[PDB]
Every structure is written in structure tokens, then in C-alpha cells.
Design a protein around this ligand. Structure first.
Ligand SMILES: CCCCCCCCCCCCCCCCCC(=O)OC[C@H](COP(=O)([O-])OCC(O)COP(=O)([O-])OC[C@@H](COC(=O)CCCCCCCCCCCCCCCCC)OC(=O)CCCCCCCCCCCCCCCCC)OC(=O)CCCCCCCCCCCCCCCCC
Ligand SMILES: CCCCCCCCCCCCCCCCCC(=O)OC[C@H](COP(=O)([O-])OCC[N+](C)(C)C)OC(=O)CCCCCCCCCCCCCCCCC
Ligand code: SF4
Ligand code: SF4
Ligand code: SF4
Ligand code: SF4
Ligand code: FES
Ligand SMILES: [K+]
Ligand SMILES: [Zn+2]
Lengths: 96, 179, 115, 176, 115, 129, 95, 60, 209, 263
């Protein structure tokens, strides 16, 4: 979800938004900023949480060799769905 | 492509056949070159007997390759100092008699034919083997092993941060360039 | 001997019409120029051994063909050049005086590899 | 083994001198040169009709960096910065920061197109195949600035191509 | 270890000697280099440019280095005489484009953190 | 031992004029040495064995564009190497440069006794290994 | 390929060669651009046993340059045996 | 009579940057050394480095 | 050498260079400081500065050495060592297919009489050394700045010379000519501290000096 | 005197009695690989990485805790010592999670650099791994306990140096975990010091986390000002701003430890 600034300046996922007083905004008129509308924060948020009944789940991320190293995910935290640092896919432990 | 410790990537499937397709016809185009240039009197009278250089003067000037072989000097790096597998392959060294621009020109085009010979032998001598040394401290581990094993992860990580630790010393490893 | 060759295989260097006796007389030159060198000097004991030997096989068979493979010096015409080069040295160190000991040891760790 | 080149000897007999004298007076090797070019005139050309015809390439082509994304949607680059360390021209400029979710994500990923060399080292660096060189070469520009790429352009390039480069690494990761 | 090999200047006078004709040639050099190279610089400020270059480094006392700038200055002159150097190279000594660096501590302070 | 018209040079060598560094960069540049302290997170020691020539850091203004750290300090990126401080100062004085010294960080004697970690009337007993 | 017959004999005559036997443009001999999955081999030392790095550690095997003479009967010797004269190529002895 | 082939017009301090980079990043310099026979330069660099490393390349 | 990772050693010629090294050492012990060979069958005999003439004149003319192919005239700065500049020769023997290499030590000022006589190939190399490292050589026919820019300042491969340099260039309209301003980089060279603090090779380790 | 001469790998050097093998090795300059041993901290002898073979012995001696005897040849480069080094090194590395690009210790990891020099060039592990629940303590130090090699340096630098009971080694065998069992928040004034003692990224600095990496930083040394001690510190400017503070070793003022308020 891209957000706009008061001067109509759409913000990027990093949060950069040049204010009106910034002289560095003059390259922006007559032209445009390229904004990755697919904000990386919310195309992972809508992804569901898979249910695997094990204490440690591999996280290859699909594609076999095409993915991220198979860092093993610890699954015993009931209050925290264990997510992978590489791909961010949240993994869960069946509700006992 | 050629990196310390082997070669980076492997030959794509079918490319060796394409090399044979090109090699089988490249001999024709050099017959076209020699016919166009070598025989024509304009090419000779403009380029032969021009820029001669004596053998002792040539070598003592630090010259090499086509400078020496064209000007009578009998020396080639592959034949004398055999580096890599160049000893196994067979070829001829087209040295010249006088050593002018024309003689050097003919020396180049005869090495071209000799290059085709070396291509023929090595292409038919392709072995079953890996493309890079089996030493992860100098060669990057396979991408399948990259994301599978911890040693491979570290070894590629460190090789791609600082590289590899080369033992001290110095050398003058020299091979003949096509120049 | 045989038929005198037309090309030596190297431009500039020509076939000598007087192969062996020319090489012999310049070889006697490199015996005598070596004379004014003291015997304890190493270059003498190397040279007169290498001198007095190849003065032998040249007079061992006056023919050009066999003598190419007596010395492994290639064609005789370049042996004239190289023996002349050896003559040049004997004149060179007649003034170099390279036999008293090493001039001075190198400044501290002047090689020291690695640092 | 060796071989001379210019060691042909001219024959002095009546026949041989006649051909050489005929060659000098009646230019024949010159006509031989003429015949070579004329035979090539009737030879079909090999001129690729750009832009409608385009030269061949290989699935390994390197150019036009573009960050990719996982099938879920999140971008691949975890800011492991091996590409930065490897980059032999130091064209890459990456600054990391802990994202609000918790996993890393580069807040600054500029690769200067006119410092880069397209050596293909960067794809071999990141183990998550985050940055790759796409098949594009059709990004010539008229101002020096637009060559200076950033994270936003890199992602936009990735989303633009993705599908083409998706099959490229699928047919090449076996070799790698 | 104070005793070391000299290049050309066995003493100070020979170092003073070589500086002399170096300026003799260079003083005779300024009017024409402007003339051929079409430099918009009068002869006068060309001449004393060589002057303050000459004592911009005329403070060192080691005889081994002073003649090294002599040959360095010697050959900077040779490169100029034969139109090898171009307009940018001759002008390059005549610094134009940069503003004078600060003189008082007030000016050092006002520009930035630089000293 | 090298007798060829040698000149008895009694003055310290000053090669500063040959190297032709800018005058503002030979006086207004404090040049310092020390042997690097080991990176505390890394127990390895094979880096605190050499002296280095490093300089003072000038200003680093952010670029008006994307934001590279534009610098105008050519001498900043000049980390040299030195086997001993005596050779380090020798380079410093040979091209006379405003310099300061620093002493080699030398380890102290760690009196280690694994038998001490367990005791009867001594308090160095460790509760958990 | 392409061309017609009477053109071929025209360029065949003018060049004195049969160009139709082999040309300089690829038509159908080119290998198919898409290829099967290239199952690559493994390393020569790829084994779960007796492959410790104690054996193959070439970087470690290197020894500092072996010193023989330092500042701090006999016979003459050569740096290498004198080279031997190559013979004419029996394939093409004279161009 | 006398010829002076002045050079430098393309000069790049190739080995000056080679010192600051490591061996792998140094490899593209060699490919750009001779812009005619590029991989032959790669051959020389790879042979030199693996000569110091006391490691020989695989026969393939 | 059943293992294919390490390169095989070659002992027959390895002993041959050492024998030849002693052979050269005994002849001219006035100038050879020390001689040694490495693992990769590369022998190096070390000479004194004023020895550029006869040692090469030896290798160029000896009937049993005859090293005439001048390979390269390199220099290696070592700031630690007093004679930081280390001029390195390299010769190749045509008949005996070997590579000799002689190197000396030299200060910034101390000269070397030009070895263009033994090898005129050194002449063109000799220009580069004074351009590239800055070491002046005595009695040189024409020792010129040939590879660096016209009117350059200093010697770039002295390890005290910045990689970026000292002067940058641009075309200036108000003078209609290229003006050499001091460098002002758009981006600073991000130096990388690439030195593992653990022992790399116990073999070549320097003992406590 | 009572000094004892020991012919370490040949070269013979005297040393005070009771001195362990490592001090003899580093006396020559032999940096013997170690993980669970830090100079000013109690001895564990746990990692078994400093196993070096002593001459005239049928067993490899644990050089960490073992004192030196009257005359001994430390086989530093022997095959047996390197075999012992290789066996335990891949042993620690076996259960190590594959997060070098993710873990902040990348480029300043002992487990990384040691494997470059004293390590294999491939793997022989085919089974799965073990993942540990990340103990959450402090908004100032981050714990990734799957990366822990259980060198117990944290627990000793805690109980001896900090003099506070904070961490434990709860569990048994492969399942023994370094932590607090019951949840807490370790809060010492010098709490920001275990980050550096940790040979791996099991404990890292939260604010500096995911911000900069070794080769970018150009370390500059200075002293602390937050306290009257004036602790020697190392600044970590990367591109014109300060990332992290390292406790420069000087012994008298601060050794190589600095309190949180300074780092
Ligand atoms: C002068 C010689 C006589 C006129 C040209 C004769 C000619 O081209 O003959 C065809 C043909 C052209 O050369 P080719 O290399 O054999 O062609 C190979 C392919 O068939 C060529 O394949 P292609 O795909 O090119 O074949 C189709 C081609 C076929 O094109 C033709 O047949 C040319 C004539 C088109 C009307 O037509 C086109 O491509 C359409 C565009 C035509 C462009 C403009 C042509 C102008 C011709 C002259 C106009 C008056 C001046 O030549 C022959 O068949 C024999 C040589 C000529 C003999 C002429 C009579 C004696
Ligand atoms: C439709 C278009 C039709 C015409 C196409 C062009 C025809 C002319 C050019 C090609 C001629 C044949 C090419 C050929 O075989 O050349 C090699 C051949 C042979 O060349 P050669 O150099 O090998 O000579 C071999 C014969 N000896 C050794 C005795 C010299 O060329 C000829 O035979 C040319 C003969 C005629 C030359 C006439 C020159 C003088 C003309 C004066 C004005 C009339
Ligand atoms: S292709 Fe090479 S130069 Fe370009 S960004 Fe990648 S690593 Fe850097
Ligand atoms: S190497 Fe790949 S994963 Fe690492 S920072 Fe660069 S793009 Fe991201
Ligand atoms: S601590 Fe573990 S994950 Fe982190 S860099 Fe070291 S080996 Fe890699
Ligand atoms: S958390 Fe770190 S210091 Fe503590 S035992 Fe584990 S690896 Fe050692
Ligand atoms: S370091 Fe000695 S056993 Fe862990
Ligand atoms: K740590
Ligand atoms: Zn994952």
C-alpha cells in the first residue's frame, strides 16, 4: 500500500518522502518517481500460515535449488509463529 | 570464464557440436583470405621486404611470438615450455625465413590453420570431469551445495567476501598470447 | 662439410664458408684471453674445462654435419656467435674483477618476504 | 614439430618462367582476386534486419540488473551484501536496516550502471539468487542520471521482466 | 652510514651549478612557449612563474635530492620545447579556476571543518 | 665498503619535494601510527602484528544525488604497512610529515590454572562450567 | 541454400570452390537452442570417507623458497638440457 | 629516420587498482588488458594464481 | 600424486636450478648476496645494485647460461625496508628454456646505470619505471615520462600515492579548455578490511622478529 | 630459576611451571585455534578445538586446561593434531543453522574464519538439524540460540566478571541450551559486552543489528567519555556515521570490556 505525502508525493516502502522545503524535489516535476507499488511489506502479510506438526520444520522455500538455504525453523513458541529470516513465510505448530 | 582453480561454468549442452559446425567450414574462409591477400602482387610489393629484423636484434629487443618465429627465430611457448595440456595436443610452429611484415602475415594465417588442428584434437578429447577444482577454499561450492550444507555456505561466503588466502611469494607464469 | 647451406634458418646470420678453422682460431683466442685471470677464480675453472673440451670435438671431426650434435649448439654458425659471446665476457671481467667477496651484506632485512 | 612458410623455390625452366611472365603481364592473380569478390556478390548477405530481426543470444546473458521476488511476493534480497563485497567496480551501494516485520530488507540498493561491468559476479554472490542480470540490453539512455539505478528502479525492473528471467535461471541453475 | 652515492652533485656548488643553466634555458624559454602555444599570458608573469617555482622547493639541503629536481625540472623543460605539451599543460601551472584557500582562522572556520 | 665518491650525508633525508604532494597535504595532515587492536568479537590474533600509516579523517558530505559519501580527501584511503615502528617512523621522517607515536599493545601474563576453578578454601571456585 | 542452381555454378566458378558443400551461414545444423537438463558430474574427491583436508591442502603444502647460498672435483652444469631441433611436419613439409 | 611511438593515451593504472581488489575482482582487469585475445589473458592470470596456490585445475 | 587437487612437483629440474644457482654463485660471489628456489621450480639469484651490468652481461653471453630474452623490469615497493624500491629483472634462456630472475634494492634517489646495453628491451621498460615508480636510472639514453600523463606530479605506484590521484579534469567554458582541478570524488572508495586474524599458512609464517 | 624449557615443535623456550599449553604456543606465536577460552576468563576445555598432539603420547592432549611438563614437543602441524582439529570443527559446524548471510557475525565470526584455515572443503552431514528457541532478554542484546556453539563463554563472563547470576546451561546433551530457564532480562551495567565475547552470532547487538558489516567499517580508536574511566574504544564509521563501539584492549583503563552506557 503506497502512501502519499501532503504535496502528493507517494512514499516508498523505505519511507523516503522529500518535503516541500527540500530543493531536491525539482527533479520530480515534469517527470516522475518510479514507485514499486507492490510494497514488499504487504505481499507477505496476506500470505497464510501453514500448519506442520513438528518441533523443527525445514524452510527451503520451494523450487528445490531455486530458493533460499534450508535454515531450520524452530516451532515451539505458542505466542509467536516461527517465521524464516530468509523468506518470511510464517510457519505454525498445531494448536494443542 | 577461466578463473583460478578451473573454469567457472560448464559447457552448455550441444555447444560442442556447434563448434564442430563452425570449425568444419572455417577452413574455407581462410582459403578465401589467402587467395585474396597472399597471391596478389599488390599485397606482396607493399608489405614484403618491409620492416625486416635480424634474429639476434629481434630476440635481444625483447620481442616474442610472431616477432621471433616470423624472423627466423625457432621458439614457441607451447612446444618448449608445455603449460596446461598443450603438450598432449599436436600442432606445427610456422616460422619464417626472412621476417618482414608479409612473412609475419603468413605466419599468422598458418597458425590459424594450426589453431584449427588444436581445436580438432581437444574437441574430440573432451573428458568426463568437473569444471573447477574440488577445493572449496579456492573454488566456489556448487549452488546445490550452497543451500544444502554449512561448510559450502561458509566457504562461498568467505570466498566472496575476501577471496582466498594465497601463499606468499612471486612468480612469472607466462604463456604465449595470440599476439 | 658437404654442400654449403644457403640459409642458416635465422635472418642476419649467414652460413660461414670457413666453419671449423675460424671457430678454432677464435677458440684459441678464448684460451689466451682467459690467461690473465688467476687460477683460484671460479670462472677460470669453469671456463677452461668448457673451453678445452669443445676445442676437442671440433678437431675431432672437421665435418659440419656431425659437429652440430657434438655440442648441442645447433648449427655451427650460431656456435661462432655464442663462442664469440664467451670471448666478450673474458674481456668484460678483465676489468670487472668479480672474485673478491660480496661487497656488503644487505641492509638489515632487505629481502624479508613476507614483510 | 614445426614448419617453414616462405621457403618456396621458383623454378627457372621455360614452362615456369612463362607462367610467371604471363602472370605479370596478363594479370591473373589480380583477376583471381576479382573472381573471389564477384562470387561473394552473388552470395546471400547475413545482415540481421534490426529491430525486426534480432541477434541470437543464450539463456546465460548478463545485463540490466533486476531484483526478484519469492513466489509469496516478498523480495529476495535479504541484504547479505556479498554482491557489495564481490562487486569489482564497487558499483553497488547497499545500506541495511531492520524492517518493521523483523527480517532484513535493504533501504538503499543503488547499482551505478556506468560503474558496473556486467561481469555476472553479483548473481553468484547472494545465495538467495536475489540480484540477477536480465536479458535486457535495450536500456540506452540520453541523460547520465537515469543510468544511476536505485532500489525502486531495480524492483520495477524485476517486476517488469521476472517471467522471462524466471525460466532463464530454471534452465541454467543446473550448470551453476 | 652517512656516506652515500651521489647522482651528479658531488657538492652543493654542482647542485647550484646545474640549477644555473637550467634557469638559463628556462628563462630563454618562456617568451616563445607563449608565442607558439598561443597562450594569452604575457612574457613577464611567465618568467617569474619559473622564479617562484624555483624557490618553492629551494629549501632542502640534501645534495642527493636537489639535483633530482634538477633533472625533473630539466625534463619538464624538454617536454615543453617540442610542442609535446599542449595549452592545458602549460596553463595547468597557471592555476586559475580554484578560489584562494583560506588565509585567516576566520576563513578556515567559515568554510567548514577542514583545517 | 661501497667506495665510489660517496657523499657524507649528515642531514636527514627529505624526499618530500620529489613526490610532489600538494603543499596543503603535507603540513595540514597529521599522520599517525599504531598496531590495530584485535576485533573484540574475533578471538583471532593474526592482525595485530604490523604498524600502519593512516591519516586524519576529513569531512564526508552526503551527495546531492542518491547519497554517496562524496569526499575530497585523497590521502584518507592510504593505509600503509610497517613491520616495525622504527621502519614506520623512518618512512614518516624520510618524507617529513607531522607525526605522532604509539606503543605496541603487549599482552600480560594470564596465570591460568584449571585446578584453581575447584577449591576448598579458595574463592575462585566456578559454579558452572 | 536459398539460392538457385545457376547462381551456385556462377559463384562456384568465380571462386573455383564448391561453396554449397559448406557455407558460412547456419541453416539447420545448429543444435536445438532448448536442451535437456544437464546433469553435471561431481568432484573427484566427493566422498563421505577418507577425504580429510589434512591430505589435500595445497595451500599448506607450499614451503618457503628453499635457500641454498646466503651472504650471511666440480663440474659445469646447465639450467636445463639443451633443446632439440624440431623436424619438418610430415603432413605438410613444404608450403 | 627516427620514430617515437608515444603512448599513454589510453593508459589506466591497472595494477594500481589490482592491489586494492582481491584476486577474483582482479580477474576482470585481465580480460580488459588485451581487448582482442581476452580469455588468453584470463589463462595467464589463472595459471599464475593457481601456481602460487599449489593447486592444479581439473583435466576437464 | 594420486590426488588431483594439488599440482605435482617436479624434482629433476628442481635440483637443476639449485645446481645452476650455485654455479652462478661461485663464479661471481662479489655480487650475489643469496640465491634460492621456490616450490614452483622458479629460481631467483639476488644481486647488488651496482651489479646490473656484469650479471646480465654474464647471463646474456655465457655459453652455459645464455639467458638473453629480457622478460620484464618490475619494481616492488616495500615501505618497511629502507631501500623500499626493489628493481626486478627477468631473463629467459632460449636454448635452456629456463627463466632467471635477478632483483636489487634501491632508495628513492640512488641510481642504477642503465642496462640498455645488455638488453635494449630494458630501454623502453626503463622509461616506465621512472614514470610508474619514479626511480631514476643513471646514464640512460632518453629516460622519459612515457606512460603517465604530460606534466604529472609524483609517482603513482609509490604506496603513498592515492588511488584516485591528486588532480581531476573537466572542460571549462570560461576558459574553453580542460582545467585540472583537485579531485573531488562523487563516491569515496569504500575500502574493505580483508584480513582474517587467524593464521593463514603455518609454513610461510614470519617468526618473532 | 624454576623456569621450564619446552621444545615446542622443535624450537625450545623456557616457561614458568603450571603454564598451560596455549600460553607456550602463543609465546612462540602459534595462535592455537580456540573457541571457549578467552585470556581474562576461566578455562572450560569444552570446544575440544585446541586439541593438539603432544609428542610421545598415545592420546591427543587437551591443550586448553593442560599444564606443560618438563620438555614437550607440541605437534602443531602434525596430521594427528590437524585430524583432531578437523573432527571437532565440522562437529561444531554440523548443527549450525545456515544463516551466515542473515547472522550479523558474518565477516567477524570465529566459526567462519577458523573453518577457512582449519576446516574442510565440503560436508558429510545428511540428516536434519536442531533448532533452538530464541531466548528473549534485553532490548539491547539479541539472542539467536540456534547459532550457539555452547562454548559457555557467556556464562563464565557473566558469573565471574559481571558477578551476577543471569544465564545457565539448561538441558542435557544435544538438547542442553544456554539461557535463563525462567524468562528474565539480564541488565548489568556491562551487559553489552557478551556480544563481543560470543564467538558466533548467537548473541548480537540489537541496535547495530542489520546495519553494517566488517569490510565496510573503517575502525577508528578513541576513548569513552560517558564515564570518568575514559575507556579505550573503537569507532565503526562506515560511510560517514558511527555504527558500533568496540572495547579496545588496553588493560589498565578498561581491558577489552566496556559498559552499556558507553557502547
Ligand atoms: C540483371 C539480371 C536480370 C534481372 C534479375 C533476375 C533475377 O533476379 O532472377 C532471380 C534470381 C535472383 O538471384 P538468386 O541468387 O538466384 O536468388 C535466390 C533466391 O531465389 C532469392 O529469394 P527471394 O526470396 O529474394 O525471392 C523472391 C524475389 C525474386 O526476385 C526476382 O525474381 C527478381 C525480379 C523481381 C521482379 O522477389 C522479392 O524478393 C521481391 C522484392 C523484389 C525487389 C526488387 C527486384 C527488382 C528486380 C529488377 C527490376 C528492374 C530493374 O536469379 C536467377 O534466378 C538467375 C540469375 C539471373 C538470371 C537473369 C536472366 C538471364
Ligand atoms: C554475369 C557476369 C559474367 C562475368 C563475370 C566476371 C568474369 C571475369 C572475372 C572472373 C574471371 C575468372 C576468374 C578466375 O578463374 O581467375 C583465376 C584465373 C587464373 O589465375 P592465376 O593467377 O591462378 O593464373 C593461373 C595461370 N598461370 C599460372 C599460367 C598464370 O584467371 C584467369 O585465368 C584470367 C584469364 C584472363 C585474364 C585477362 C586479363 C587481361 C584482360 C585485358 C582486357 C580484355
Ligand atoms: S555485474 Fe559485477 S560489477 Fe556489475 S553490479 Fe554485479 S558484481 Fe558489480
Ligand atoms: S548479494 Fe544478493 S542477497 Fe546479498 S545484498 Fe546483494 S542482492 Fe541482496
Ligand atoms: S555465527 Fe554462524 S551464521 Fe553467523 S556468520 Fe558465523 S557461521 Fe555464519
Ligand atoms: S551464547 Fe555465545 S557465548 Fe554463550 S555459549 Fe552460546 S556461543 Fe558461547
Ligand atoms: S577453546 Fe580450548 S576447548 Fe574450547
Ligand atoms: K558475537
Ligand atoms: Zn524460509
Amino acid at each position: 500500500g503506497v502512501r502519499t505525502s501532503p504535496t502528493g508525493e507517494k512514499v516508498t516502502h523505505t519511507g523516503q518522502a522529500y518535503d516541500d522545503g527540500d530543493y531536491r524535489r525539482v527533479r520530480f516535476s515534469d517527470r516522475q518517481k518510479e514507485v514499486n507499488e507492490n510494497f514488499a511489506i504487504d505481499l507477505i502479510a496476506e500470505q497464510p500460515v501453514s500448519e506442520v506438526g513438528s518441533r523443527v520444520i525445514s524452510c527451503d522455500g520451494g523450487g528445490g535449488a531455486l530458493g533460499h538455504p534450508r535454515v531450520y525453523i524452530n516451532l515451539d513458541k505458542e505466542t509467536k509463529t516461527g517465521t524464516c529470516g530468509y523468506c518470511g513465510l510464517q510457519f505454525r505448530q498445531p494448536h494443542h | 570464464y577461466i578463473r583460478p582453480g578451473g573454469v567457472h561454468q560448464d559447457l552448455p549442452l550441444g555447444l560442442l557440436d556447434d563448434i564442430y559446425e563452425f570449425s568444419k567450414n572455417f577452413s574455407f574462409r581462410i582459403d578465401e583470405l589467402e587467395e585474396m591477400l597472399t597471391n596478389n602482387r599488390i599485397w606482396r610489393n607493399r608489405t614484403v621486404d618491409i620492416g625486416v629484423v635480424t634474429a639476434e636484434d629481434a630476440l635481444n629487443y625483447g620481442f616474442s611470438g610472431v616477432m621471433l618465429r616470423g624472423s627466423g627465430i625457432q621458439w614457441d611457448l607451447r612446444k618448449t615450455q608445455p603449460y596446461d595440456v598443450y603438450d598432449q595436443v599436436e600442432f606445427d610452429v610456422p616460422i619464417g625465413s626472412r621476417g618482414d611484415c608479409y612473412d609475419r602475415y603468413l605466419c599468422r594465417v598458418e597458425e590459424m590453420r594450426q589453431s584449427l588442428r588444436i581445436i580438432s584434437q581437444c574437441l574430440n578429447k573432451m573428458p568426463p570431469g568437473e569444471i573447477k577444482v574440488d577445493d572449496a577454499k579456492v573454488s566456489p561450492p556448487k549452488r546445490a551445495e550452497m543451500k544444502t550444507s554449512m561448510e559450502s555456505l561458509i566457504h562461498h561466503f568467505k570466498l566472496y567476501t575476501e577471496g582466498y588466502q594465497v601463499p606468499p611469494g612471486a612468480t612469472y607464469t607466462a604463456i604465449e598470447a595470440p599476439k | 662439410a658437404g654442400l654449403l647451406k644457403k640459409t642458416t634458418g635465422l635472418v642476419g646470420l649467414a652460413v660461414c664458408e670457413t666453419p671449423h678453422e675460424r671457430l678454432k682460431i677464435l677458440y684459441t683466442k678464448i684460451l689466451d684471453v682467459l690467461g690473465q685471470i688467476p687460477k683460484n677464480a671460479a670462472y677460470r675453472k669453469y671456463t677452461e674445462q668448457i673451453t678445452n673440451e669443445k676445442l676437442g670435438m671440433v678437431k675431432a671431426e672437421p665435418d659440419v654435419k656431425k659437429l652440430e650434435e657434438q655440442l648441442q649448439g645447433g648449427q655451427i654458425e650460431e656456435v661462432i656467435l655464442q663462442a664469440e659471446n664467451e670471448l666478450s665476457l673474458a674481456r668484460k671481467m678483465l676489468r670487472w674483477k668479480p672474485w673478491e667477496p660480496l661487497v656488503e651484506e644487505p641492509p638489515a632485512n632487505q629481502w624479508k618476504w613476507p614483510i | 614439430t614445426y614448419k617453414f612458410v616462405n621457403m618456396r623455390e621458383p623454378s627457372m625452366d621455360m614452362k615456369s618462367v612463362t607462367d610467371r611472365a604471363a602472370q605479370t603481364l596478363l594479370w591473373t592473380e589480380l583477376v583471381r582476386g576479382l573472381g573471389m569478390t564477384l562470387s561473394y556478390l552473388f552470395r546471400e548477405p547475413a545482415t540481421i534486419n534490426y529491430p525486426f530481426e534480432k541477434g541470437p543470444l543464450s539463456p546465460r546473458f548478463r545485463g540490466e540488473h533486476a531484483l526478484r521476488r519469492y513466489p509469496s511476493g516478498e523480495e529476495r534480497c535479504i541484504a547479505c551484501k556479498l554482491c557489495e563485497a564481490v562487486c569489482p567496480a564497487q558499483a553497488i551501494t547497499i545500506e541495511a536496516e531492520p524492517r518493521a516485520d523483523g527480517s532484513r530488507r535493504t533501504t538503499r540498493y543503488d547499482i551505478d550502471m556506468t560503474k558496473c561491468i556486467y561481469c555476472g559476479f553479483c548473481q553468484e554472490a547472494c545465495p538467495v539468487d536475489a540480484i540477477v542480470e536480465g536479458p535486457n540490453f535495450e536500456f540506452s539512455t540520453e541523460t547520465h542520471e537515469e543510468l544511476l539505478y536505485n532500489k525502486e528502479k531495480l524492483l520495477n525492473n524485476g517486476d517488469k521482466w521476472e517471467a522471462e528471467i524466471a525460466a532463464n535461471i530454471q534452465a541454467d541453475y543446473l550448470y551453476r | 652510514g652517512t656516506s652515500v652515492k651521489p647522482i651528479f652533485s658531488r657538492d652543493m656548488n654542482e647542485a647550484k651549478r646545474r640549477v644555473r643553466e637550467l634557469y638559463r634555458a628556462w628563462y630563454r624559454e618562456v617568451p616563445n612557449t607563449v608565442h607558439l602555444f598561443q597562450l594569452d599570458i604575457s612574457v613577464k608573469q611567465g618568467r617569474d612563474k619559473v622564479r617562484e617555482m624555483f624557490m618553492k622547493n629551494a629549501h632542502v639541503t640534501d645534495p642527493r635530492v636537489v639535483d633530482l629536481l634538477v633533472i625533473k625540472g630539466k625534463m619538464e623543460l624538454e617536454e615543453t620545447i617540442n610542442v609535446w605539451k599542449q595549452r592545458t599543460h602549460i596553463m595547468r601551472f597557471f592555476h586559475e579556476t580554484e578560489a584562494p584557500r583560506p588565509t585567516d582562522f576566520l576563513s578556515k572556520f567559515y568554510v567548514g571543518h577542514d583545517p | 665498503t661501497q667506495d665510489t665518491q660517496l657523499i657524507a650525508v649528515d642531514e636527514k633525508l627529505d624526499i618530500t619535494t620529489l613526490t610532489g604532494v600538494p603543499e596543503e597535504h603535507i603540513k595540514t595532515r597529521k599522520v599517525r601510527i599504531f598496531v590495530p587492536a584485535r576485533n573484540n568479537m574475533q578471538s583471532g590474533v593474526n592482525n595485530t602484528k604490523k604498524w600502519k600509516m593512516e591519516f586524519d579523517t576529513r569531512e564526508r558530505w552526503e551527495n546531492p544525488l542518491m547519497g554517496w559519501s562524496s569526499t575530497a580527501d585523497p590521502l584518507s584511503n592510504l593505509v600503509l604497512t610497517f613491520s616495525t615502528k622504527e621502519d614506520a617512523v623512518a618512512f614518516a621522517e624520510k618524507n617529513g610529515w607531522s607525526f605522532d607515536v604509539e606503543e605496541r599493545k603487549v599482552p600480560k601474563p594470564k596465570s591460568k590454572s584449571y585446578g584453581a576453578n575447584f577449591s576448598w578454601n579458595k574463592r575462585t571456585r566456578v559454579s558452572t562450567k | 541454400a536459398s539460392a538457385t542452381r545457376v547462381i551456385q555454378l556462377l559463384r562456384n566458378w568465380a571462386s573455383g570452390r564448391d561453396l554449397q558443400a559448406k557455407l558460412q551461414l547456419r541453416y539447420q545444423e545448429i543444435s536445438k537452442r532448448t536442451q535437456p537438463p544437464p546433469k553435471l558430474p561431481v568432484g573427484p574427491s566427493h566422498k563421505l570417507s577418507n577425504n580429510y583436508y589434512c591430505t589435500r591442502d595445497g595451500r599448506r603444502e607450499a614451503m618457503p623458497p628453499s635457500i641454498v647460498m646466503s651472504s650471511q672435483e666440480k663440474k659445469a652444469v646447465t639450467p636445463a638440457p639443451p633443446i632439440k631441433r624440431w623436424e619438418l611436419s610430415k603432413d605438410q613439409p613444404y608450403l | 629516420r627516427k620514430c617515437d611511438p608515444h603512448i599513454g593515451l589510453l593508459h589506466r593504472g591497472t595494477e594500481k587498482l589490482i592491489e586494492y581488489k582481491t584476486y577474483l575482482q582482479a580477474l576482470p582487469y585481465f580480460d580488459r588488458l588485451d581487448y582482442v585475445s581476452m580469455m588468453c589473458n584470463e589463462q595467464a592470470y589463472s595459471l599464475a594464481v593457481e601456481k602460487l596456490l599449489n593447486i592444479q585445475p581439473p583435466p576437464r | 600424486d594420486t590426488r588431483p587437487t594439488i599440482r605435482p612437483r617436479n624434482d629433476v629440474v628442481h635440483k637443476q636450478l639449485s645446481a645452476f644457482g650455485q654455479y652462478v654463485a661461485e663464479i661471481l660471489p662479489k655480487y650475489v648476496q643469496q640465491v634460492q628456489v621456490s616450490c614452483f621450480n622458479e629460481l631467483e639469484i639476488f644481486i647488488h645494485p651496482d651489479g646490473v651490468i656484469p650479471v646480465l652481461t654474464f647471463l646474456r653471453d655465457h655459453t652455459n647460461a645464455q639467458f638473453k630474452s629480457l622478460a620484464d623490469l618490475t619494481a616492488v615497493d616495500v615501505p618497511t625496508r629502507q631501500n623500499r624500491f626493489e628493481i626486478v629483472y627477468n631473463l629467459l634462456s632460449l636454448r635452456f628454456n629456463s627463466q632467471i630472475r635477478v632483483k636489487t634494492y634501491t632508495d628513492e634517489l640512488t641510481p642504477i646505470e642503465s642496462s640498455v646495453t645488455v638488453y635494449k628491451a630494458a630501454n623502453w621498460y626503463e622509461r616506465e619505471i621512472w614514470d610508474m615508480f619514479g626511480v631514476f636510472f643513471a646514464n640512460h639514453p632518453d629516460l622519459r615520462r612515457i606512460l603517465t600523463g604530460y606534466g604529472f606530479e609524483g609517482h603513482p605506484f609509490r604506496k603513498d600515492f592515492p588511488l584516485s590521484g591528486y588532480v581531476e579534469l573537466r572542460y571549462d567554458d570560461e576558459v574553453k579548455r580542460v582545467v585540472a582541478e583537485p579531485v573531488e570524488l562523487a563516491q569515496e572508495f569504500r575500502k574493505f578490511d580483508l584480513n582474517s586474524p587467524w593464521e593463514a599458512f603455518p609454513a610461510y609464517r614470519q617468526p618473532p622478529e | 630459576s624454576n623456569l621450564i624449557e619446552v621444545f615446542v615443535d622443535g624450537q625450545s623456550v623456557m616457561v614458568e611451571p603450571g603454564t598451560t599449553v596455549l600460553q607456550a604456543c602463543e609465546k612462540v606465536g602459534m595462535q592455537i585455534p580456540r573457541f571457549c577460552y578467552h585470556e581474562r576468563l576461566s578455562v572450560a576445555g569444552n570446544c575440544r578445538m585446541c586439541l593438539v598432539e603432544i609428542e610421545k603420547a598415545p592420546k591427543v592432549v587437551a591443550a586448553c586446561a593442560m599444564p606443560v611438563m618438563k620438555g614437550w614437543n607440541i605437534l602443531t602441524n602434525s596430521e594427528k593434531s590437524k585430524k583432531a582439529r578437523e573432527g571437532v570443527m565440522e562437529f561444531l559446524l554440523a548443527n549450525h543453522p545456515l544463516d551466515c548471510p542473515i547472522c550479523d557475525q558474518g565477516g567477524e565470526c570465529d566459526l567462519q574464519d577458523q573453518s577457512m584455515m582449519f576446516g574442510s572443503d565440503r560436508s558429510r552431514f545428511l540428516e536434519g538439524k536442531r533448532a533452538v528457541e530464541d531466548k528473549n532478554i534485553g532490548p539491547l542484546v539479541k539472542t539467536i540460540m540456534t547459532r550457539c556453539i555452547q562454548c559457555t563463554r557467556c556464562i563464565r563472563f557473566a558469573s565471574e566478571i559481571a558477578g551476577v547470576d543471569d544465564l545457565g546451561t539448561t538441558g542435557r546433551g544435544n538438547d542442553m541450551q544456554v539461557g535463563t530457564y525462567i524468562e528474565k532480562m539480564f541488565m548489568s551495567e556491562l551487559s553489552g559486552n557478551i556480544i563481543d565475547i560470543c564467538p558466533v552470532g548467537a548473541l548480537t547487538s540489537k541496535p547495530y543489528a542489520f546495519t553494517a558489516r566488517p569490510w565496510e567499517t573503517r575502525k577508528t580508536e578513541s576513548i569513552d567519555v560517558m564515564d570518568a574511566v575514559g575507556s579505550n574504544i573503537v569507532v565503526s564509521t562506515r560511510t560517514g556515521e558511527v555504527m558500533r563501539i568496540l572495547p579496545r584492549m588496553h588493560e589498565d583503563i578498561n581491558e577489552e570490556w566496556i559498559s552499556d552506557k558507553t557502547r
